[PDB]
Amino acid sequence: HHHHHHMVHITLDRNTANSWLIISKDRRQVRMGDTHQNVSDNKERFSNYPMVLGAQRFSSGKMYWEVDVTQKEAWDLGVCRDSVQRKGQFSLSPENGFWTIWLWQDSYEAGTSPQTTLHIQVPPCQIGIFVDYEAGVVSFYNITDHGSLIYTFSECVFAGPLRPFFNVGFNYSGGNAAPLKLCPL
Ligand SMILES: Cn1ccc(C(=O)NC[C@H]2CCCO2)n1
């Protein structure tokens, strides 16, 4: 792919984070804490899952960023509507305003309804995310495997401003403590 030149500098929005997340001072890394991180509750925070949004809002153009997932067992990544539900249980689907992929139990899947099996020969350590707002496209790339395509959502109906979306996953196993990191441009 030749999307690197649409690179954007993403930072995480503390105010949207689940109350157990720890966001680094530079707002470029997030991990699961072992307890509540001593913040007040607010209507923006994801309550049920270890999720957080980027601060940036996109309503036009082409955007590209990269995320480091090294040594994680579980995570979700992509974009979502600014108006997605924050509280209670929900599925990651385009009907609910999410365009995402994930790792779970040694398999990679795209957040369609129902979910789609991904075919990855080289487990990725870094994921590239490309959004073309006007075209209605969200694509995922395997940076570890020379940028190979993972998945394309096309005919997307964004229906609002988009925000970068992250889920660090639970750490019931003790094997999923590692952070998500936004990689330098
Ligand atoms: C499950 N559910 C429905 C609505 C809410 C909500 O807004 N909670 C946030 C807090 C902290 C201050 C006000 O309430 N949570």
**What domains are defined for the chain?**
4-182 (2.60.120.920)
Distance from Cα 39 to the centre of ligand 1, integer Å: 14
Neighbouring CB atoms inside 10 A of 113's CB total: 11
Judge residue 61's burial from the number of C-beta atoms within 10 Å of its C-beta, 0-12 exposed, 13-18 middle, 19 or more buried.
exposed
This structure was determined by: X-ray
**Phi and psi, residue 141, nearest 5°:** -130, 145
Distance from Cα 43 to the centre of ligand 1, integer Å: 5
Ligand 1 and 40: CB distance under 6 A: no
Name the token pair of 76.
Answer: 């979700």
**Most informative mutation of 36, 46, 47 for ligand 1 (most atoms within 8 A of CB):** 47
Q: Ligand 1: which atom is nearest the Cα of residue 45?
A: 9
Torsion of the alpha carbons at 27, 28, 32 and 35, rounded to the nearest 10: -20
Q: How far apart are CA 131 and CA 34, in angstroms?
A: 33
DSSP assignment of 51-63: EEEBS--BSSSEE
Name the token pair of 35.
Answer: 């307890």
